Amino acid sequence: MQKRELYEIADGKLVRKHRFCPRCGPGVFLAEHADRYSCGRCGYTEFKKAKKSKS
Numbered sequence: 117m118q119k120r121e122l123y124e125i126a127d128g129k130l131v132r133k134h135r136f137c138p139r140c141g142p143g144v145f146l147a148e149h150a151d152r153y154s155c156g157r158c159g160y161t162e163f164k165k166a167k168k169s170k171s
């Protein structure tokens with residue numbers, strides 16, 4: 117049969133930009149790079165997680 121149902125979504129893009137480093141936050145921002153984050157202080161590094169949305 118094969119049903120072609122590519123239906124989009126309207127999701128409230130909730131992304132609190134300027135995500136600090138939990139414990140270093142007040143005084144040490146989380147180095148936000150285009151591809152990831154890093155913390156020259158406690159070595160806390162995190163990647164810009166690709167938002168795998170169906171649409």
Ligand SMILES: [Zn+2]
Pocket residue numbers: 137138139140144155157158159160
């Ligand atoms: Zn840190």
